[PDB]
Structure formats: C-alpha cells, structure tokens
Amino acid sequence: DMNNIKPLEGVKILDLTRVLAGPFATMNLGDLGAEVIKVERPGAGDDTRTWGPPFVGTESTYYLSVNRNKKSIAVNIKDPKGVKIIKELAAVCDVFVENYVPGKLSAMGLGYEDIDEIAPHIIYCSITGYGQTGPISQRAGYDAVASAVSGLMHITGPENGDPVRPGVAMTDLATGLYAYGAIMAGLIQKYKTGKGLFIDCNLLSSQVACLSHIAANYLIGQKEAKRWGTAHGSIVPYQAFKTKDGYIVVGAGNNQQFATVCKILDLPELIDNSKYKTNHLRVHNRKELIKILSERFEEELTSKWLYLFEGSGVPYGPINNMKNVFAEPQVLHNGLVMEMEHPTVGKISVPGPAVRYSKFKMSEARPPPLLGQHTTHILKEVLRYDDRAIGELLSAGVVDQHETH
Template sequence: MLATLARVAALRRTGLLSGLGGRRELWTVRPQSGAGDDTRTWGPPFVGTESTYFLSVNRNKKSIAVNIKDPKGVKIIKELAAVCDVFVENYVPGKLSALGLGYTDIDRIAPHVVYCSITGYGQTGPLSQRAGYDAVASAVSGLMHITGPEDGDPVRPGVAMTDLATGLYAYGAIMAGLIQRYKTGKGLFIDCNLLSSQVACLTQVAANYLIAQKEAERWGTAHGSIVPYQAFKTKDGYLVVGAGNNQQFATVCKILNLPELIDDSKYKTNHLRVQNRKELIKILSARFEVAMTREWLHHFEGSGVPYGPINNMKNVFAEPQHPAGTSQTCYLKLTVQRVSVCEQTREIISFRRHSPRDRRRENAPCSRLAARSCFHVRFIMPKHTVVTRCCTMASLWK
C-alpha cells in the first residue's frame, strides 16, 4: 500500500507505483481553501470541473481530504502510514516534522515503512527551504540553458522533464528500498530532489564541462557531437535522421542521391562532419525539402538508419506501433459512501468496469484494473458532485 502526502510535485512520482498495485493514495489540501491540489485549476482543457492535467497526474489513485494542522488529521495520517509499505511526501524540509509527520515520527510507529521525501533542492543547503517547481529547477540545473534554438533564447522543454526524471529516480530508489526491507525487515529514508535529479541527467554535457571545461551550447534539434543528427524540413513537415557512424552516413547520402558526399574529404568521419556542420547541413536540408515526409519514410524504410517524423498529438496516438493507437474511453460506475472519521470526510468507493465493446468482462479483478488502466477518481470534497473518468488502453480488454 502506498500513501502520498502531496499537492503537486510528487503526483507524477507516485503514478508508476500506484499502477503496480499501490491501491490507496492519501492527498492533503490546504485547510483554508479545501480546494484540493493545485492541478485541478491547470487548464484548459477541462472535463466537467476538472482539468485534464489533474486527471493525468492523479491516475490510479483514491483520495481523502485531511487537515494536517488538526491533531485528529495527523492521527488519521499516522493510522494509514502504519499499514502502508511506502510513504511519499513533498513538503519543504522540516514542515512535516513540525507537525509530527516527519520520518522519525513515522519510523517510530511504522519502522517497516519506506519513507520518500521529494523536495526542490534537498534536505540541507542554502536552497533547501525554497519551493520547487519543474521549470525553476530546469533553469537552475542547466537544462533550460541547453534547450532551444542555436543562437536563440533558452526554452522550457515541452513537458515537465525535471519532474518526470525525479519521479523515475524516486521510483527506482523506492523499489530498491522495498528490496532492502524484504531482506532486513526495516524501512529507510529516501531523499530525492528536483535539482540533483536533473543535474544527474546532464550526462555528457556535464562531463564536457567538468573534464574539458567546455561550456554547453544550444543546438535546437541538432546534436553537439554527431552530424547529421537532427530534424530536417520536408515538403510538408519534418523528419529526424541520425547518422551515428560512417556507414549510416553513407546510407543517408545514397538515399538522398548524394553519393559524392561519401568520399568527400570534408565529411569522411564524424569529427570532420562536426567541423563542417553548417555546409553539410545546408546541402542535406535542400535535398530533404524536395519531397513529402511520407516519401522519405518510404525511402528510409529498412535502411538501418535511425529516422522518424515529428508527429503532432493526433499522429502520435494514431501511430500503429504505439500501444495507445487503438485506445478507447470507458467509465467506472462508482458507489460513494461518506462516513465521518474524526470530523474528516472519507470515501468508500466500490466500482465495476464497463466497456462499450465487451460487457462480459465488466467484473474483471480490481488488481488487474489498477495495474493496467489509467484509473481516475475525483478527489471528492464535501458537497461536491462526483465526476469520474477512466481512460484505458485497448490491451486492458484483451
């Protein structure tokens, strides 16, 4: 069982764990508003009163609203933590300890729990008390500095890459912690933060600076050390092509009907191609622009050269290779019963699955549903109407 004490930053981190069978989630709200986590308002688009952003990061989760500033609320959280395997929180260091919900407090009542604290900048240091958001951490960590067009302004990545990377690091650390607990019977404390996670993802960019003192640059869609490896404009779109070795470069030249480039002394090795990047890319770009994307896809098929179109969302989810290519929407029929627990509101939810295509499987095991689907249950606040959706992949019905 997994419990989460979070509003925004840890939401992406726990979706993977809950998808593997973490069947209960705990979220808190700011007592003064009772509005739930901030992602509810991050739209448009909205489904009813909920943002699709909220639905995406809160999949696979059940929820209760708890006032953590009330001793009765703290008691509820401790009771839940005592029967959990994993406890995840994303508060500024020290805040939960002041409320009696820090690692030492939980360890005292549940020494088996793997306690994961996800912060912006870690437990100590001059930035530790700052709130952490993805874009800010992306800026401080250098990711934004290396993202964007050559000679252009820094650009925020299209999705929250720092949040997602931190989630994967936290996921791996938690799984390792559970293995250790299996061997020793004892839980542990995990410190995971946005800044350290993203700096770790700088890989060769960091090595270039630390070893050779080479400052990083922005390359747009291109690669700083491999040429050609970037997006090329076609007659109706864009195609990304990469040639990581001389053989692949020769194949690209043959497909583009530019065989004279293969033995050209300026392009015979990758090192030379990097040195003469601008001239070579100008030649290749002119050739790519004469045909449609689908034509180039046909020409590159079976060539052994890495290639692919730049897809919009419509094409992404229409891609036959993608497991969501035949996705559908189903609905969960919810029965909600409210019971008073220490003046808090708790929801007991039972559900059945309904597929417009296969009614015979509507009573499938709950464990399979939790593990295979994107299970969205609205964070029900008192006096609110229940609104729920469940988006699932076609593989669920097989």
Template sequence: MAQERRPVPPCRGAGTQPGAALGSGLPPAPARPPSREIRACPGSGTGRGRRRLRRALGAVASGGDAARRAGKKEPVLRGTLEEPLPRSCRRLRQSPERCLCLPFPGQRRRGAERRRFPGRVLAGPFATMNLGDLGAEVIKVERPGYGQTGPVVQRGGYDSIAAAVSGLMHITGHEDGEPVRPGVAMTDLATGLYTYGAIMAGLLQRYKTGKGLHIDCNLLSTQVACLTHVAANYLNCKIEAKRWGTAHGSIVPYQAFKTKDGYIVVGAGNDHQFVTVCKILNLPEVSKDSRYKTNTLRVQNRKELIDILSTRFSEKATIEWLQLFEGSGVPYGPINNMQQVFSDPQVLHNGLVMEMNHPTAGKIAVPGPGVRYSEFAMSHPKPPPLVGQHTVEILKSVLGYEDDAIEELLCTGAVAQHEVR
C-alpha cells in the first residue's frame, strides 16, 4: 500500500518507496501496450462507492466463488494478486491516508493464469517487473512483508532492517570499520528474484498437477538464505563472521587494491593464479616464499602479503594494470563509477542500456534486463503507469462497471483518474 498520491518514478528497475505508487519500475513485456493502473482510495469517498468497488475487487481476488456470487464470469487475469479490500476497514480507518493500487501491465490474454502475490517497496515490484518482461499481466496490492506468520509478522519490512536483522550488515564494511549497508537494496532485489523463481515454479506445479500453491517469500528469509557459506561456517563450526571490506575471508589475494588513480580487484583462486599474479607484478621472490606457497598459508600470512602487493599496485595507474592482466587467466577488473559502467563495451554489447518515452519525464534511459532468451528478443521498453492513469479503462473493461457507476466512483472520490497529456 502507498502512503500518498505521487506519480510512479520514471525508472524501469526502481521499486516503490513509501509514498510512491505500487509497481513502480515495472515494464510491460515486449510489443505490448503500456501498463494500466487503477487506484482505489478506501479512506475517501462515500461508503456506498467504497463498498461497490470493494465487491468488485473481491470478485477478482477471490476467484470463482466471489465471481459467481457477483453473477459474473470468473475473471481470468495473468500475473499476481494479493487480496481484495478487507471486509472490515478497521486497519484502513487507522491509516486513512493509505491507498490501494492495482497496476495492470500489458494486455490481458485469453486463458492466462491468475496468481496472488504480496509485494512491498522494491522486492515485489522487482519480481513482477521480471514477470512482466516475460509477458505476465500483473495485479498487485501491497502490504508489509516478515512473512505470513510468526512472532514479528506485524512489523514493517524494509531492506535496511532485514539486512541488519539477517546479519548482512554485520559482515559488510571495512575490516576495522562500522557495519555498512550495501550500495543498492540487495535484500529487496534478492527477494524479488526468489519470488520470481517461486512463481515460475508454482506455474510448473499448476501445469503438472492441476493444483496451485501458496508462496511465502519475505525479506528476512531471503537474506538469511543468502548468507550461504558464512552461515554454514557458523552453524557447523561456530565461527563468528566478521567484516572483510573488499577482501575474502578464505581466499588471498582476492580484494581491491589501490592504484595510482583508482582501484583494481584481483583474485587468485588457486596457487597457479597466484604465481601468475606475482609474475605480472614482477615479484618472483614472493611466489617462491614458503609463507605464500598455498592458499592456506596465504590466509595465515594475509597481512604481510597484502602489504607487499598493495605497495606494488600503487605504482601504476589502473589502465596500465588492466593491460598487464589482459589474457592472463587471472580474474580482475576495475572498480568503475557509473560513467565507466555505462560506457563499458561489454555492458553496451549486452544491451543493458535501454531508452523509453515517459508520459511526464520525456525520453529516459533505464538499465535493461539481465537475461536474454534464444527464442525471442526484448522489444522497446515501456514505462510504468502513472497513478490512476487507467482507472476508467480498468473499471470498465476488467471489472465490468457501467458508465454511470464509474462516474459515481469518480465523483465521490473512491477512485481517481489521472489524465495524461
């Protein structure tokens, strides 16, 4: 649920923040019309208008039973749906500024699947954005996500909080520094990807058995699962995790080194690669030193070795080191700023810069999807809908409202229509 009436941020990959429209950053699939969105405001308008809209949304959300009670054919929608407005508006009365947003990206297809999916802030929109890239039509209503059950289920879930509670911040930052939040909302994004995969698995389950299933994805579970080897070290060996900055706890060298004008990351994943690194750095005596013969020894003597390598890396500019490492078989790369990222030849080759026309911002560039498919190409991206941009269209074509009923909802303030110039 959103806090205020604000337009969707003009960014393909951006998620909703408090006060932003739900589903922001959600592009439609290739060669399909722009997204459509209906905005229902339960805290405004007359009770009659709210009840009528609630009944219609309930028919969509509850599936066949509600639809049959409403005397209408069960709606068939592709994508995700959280829940209708609750029969009791107690929670909404407590927070009357909250609004319900139902985005409908793309065009409905006959025989499409309907899925219910709770999303929040960035994780949910990121998941449905990926589904939209594959052709899904998405219906989504947000609510705060620690999961569906448990002792803290009522708490609001946000990336930074989940990153803290899950231990991610505890292991992120300089070795001698304070905990650090990752530069992007990795917990939100990982939850979106987990959810995206779970929905695809649910579809396979449906086609295989004829039965659907309930999926519970949340920020806390996602980030704890993503602790991987750090969690395994503690669970099996009771080794408490620590911060390593850009370094790796069990591979040396594998970190960023300061150069004359920037930074370069170099990783020696085995003893042969370490010898190659020493050769490139013109430090043959280091590769022959008995203290650094194996990775285990290099980990034990980390400080002395890193001091030697750091001194050497500081003697040349980043571009010089990149040229020396080219073709060596050793993993390496510069720490790029945004200008360098989006002028990188491989980034451009992978089609990771895409342009779209936004109804209010004009022509904008956005990062493209991270996956390509052999059987179809990604078409020109389209922007997410503005808040209430397609309210009338959805009320009429999806919910089956007559013109007079739509006019009543608009006049009472139960819904709003955003006019795009």
C-alpha cells in the first residue's frame, strides 16, 4: 500500500502567504502531497487575484499560476474571532507559513511566540524582504528592490549599459525554493526532537547567497564585478549572437570546442591564429574575435545554424519566446505544460512541476481554489464548527464563503 505514496502526504500546512515568494513555496509543497490551507482576506483575497489583465473568468492568470493544489479559507485575521480560528488550525497544522513584515502578526497575536504556545510542534516559517531583525528589517520585501540592494541588478545588463532586472522575479522564486527546502528540514528535525522550530527566510539572504563565486571574487580577491550582457568574463566566445531572424547562443570552453565551432562557421583560420590559439588569448582578444564571429552568424538564419550545430557537442541554443518555448517537444515531454480542470473557469494550463520522481507522479493536480471556496468545509470538518456558528461568523463578516464549494 506504500508502493505509490507521496512524501508529504498527511502533512497539514497553514499558508497565510501572498504575492509570489510564499505561494510558490507552498505550491511546491502541495505538489509533494501536503494539504495546504490558504488563509485569505474576505472580499479581496490574495493580492495576485486583482493583478489583471490577463483575466480568465474572475480569476487572474497570475493567481492561477502559483496557487494550485491548495484549499482556500477566507478569515478576517484583524477581527478577534478570526484570530481564534487561525490558532485552532495551528493546533492541527504541522507547518505555519507567513510573509508579512516582521512583528505584524505578532502585533495581531499571531506571532511565533503566540503560535508556539498552542502548537509547540509547529514548523513556523517566515518569509521577509530582509530578515526578522536588522536596521532595514522593517522595510517591506519587493523583488526589484531586493535585486538592486543585493547586487544582482548591478551585474545584470548590457556591457557599458544601464542595469536591468531578470524577466521573472527570480529573487522571489529563489527565496520560495529556499523556504520549501527549509520547511522539509524542519519536519526532519521535528521527527527526531519532537518539537517545532522557527525558520527565517528573506530575499536579501537568498540573493546574496546566490551571488556565490561572484561575491567570493570581491570577498577574497577584492575584485569588483561588471555587466557582461550575454557574454562571460572568463570564457570567450560564450554569448548570444544575432542572426538574420533571431539570436543564437554559442559557446566554446576549450580549444577542441573552439575548433569545432570554427569549422561549423567555416572559419578554420581562426583555430591556428595566434590571437585565438588559447582561451586566455581569446579572452584578451575578445573584441576582435567576437566581431569576426558575429559577422558570420548574421549571414545565416537561426534554423540553419541549429541544423549545422546538431551533434556538435558544444554549448548551443536558440533564444526562445513564450510561443517557441512551449512549441519545443522537450518542454512538452518533460510535462512542463500542466492542464487542470477549474470548476468555474474550465480547462487551464500552467507550468508544471520542475522535479519528477520515480516512485510517485505529481501530474494530477488540484486546481487553484476560489476565494473562500473551502471556508465552510474547513470550519465544519477540521475545526468541528456547527452550522449555526458558521452562519453567525458569515453574517458578522469574520469569514467569507464562495458560491461554489
């Protein structure tokens, strides 16, 4: 009976997160089989719900992307009766996840000290902009602001050009991945000790840690980084090249690969040229070498280059737009297009799970919940509320229930 079972099956997660960093972490935990309870404000809900267009039905595409495999309960945390519901859920929930500014939930009585009293077992994870404490800890967390402060924006952009930001909020997504792993570490710690712990995850720490070798260049060698566009500082040639109909990324990491690229480009003279004999020589003569290579790539179409580079064994790929990405058979074969049946919106498609496991499949996923969709169900079953009290909560406005259950 244990042949085909998900790892986080039987783990209840109380999710109070909003926007992207938090929901992406709980979504990936939901794929692993955990039961995720999403707490939202009555009427408005998660901020992403209003982030449209694009709007499909009454649901924004932003919200649907990162909120699958969750159940929604609408509770007014500011009301004292709402605080009681959250505490009661915490008693039966293994994990507590929030992404408010430090001290906000504590001011409302939902802080870790408050939750620990009723749920000492609970794994409390807090996602913030800059951390629980510090001089700038009170500032709210924003992806673009954090990438600027953390220094990623400084090193991203065209050479001798203005800084740019990554297209998607990679700082937010990286923090969500840090937390998604950290929460599982808390569960492993919980099994041994029998007690819960507090987790601190923040955008600043996530992005700085990702700087890795680039930051180590300054910490150890006192070397300041610069923007390189699509090129690499230490490897030449390794950049995107403009073509007749698009861009192609071609790289050579050694003389064997460089000779292969030159032959495909019909430029054998470069192989034995003294300026390009070695990688260090190629880096020193980067400006001249790139100009010669760029002239060749422009002469032919991207499709012809992909045909010529087939089986080359060197790094090579095309810059793909959204239409081209999901046209790729490899993307489809990996299951990256995930389709789910939304109760009121119909069939919808979002990016699928990145990770695939041999023992179990995560292809079948629950669609993102409507605002307050499971409010009455969670109260009646999980908290054993009678119908009379639920109606009183509904009339007062403490909780909100959607038309569709």
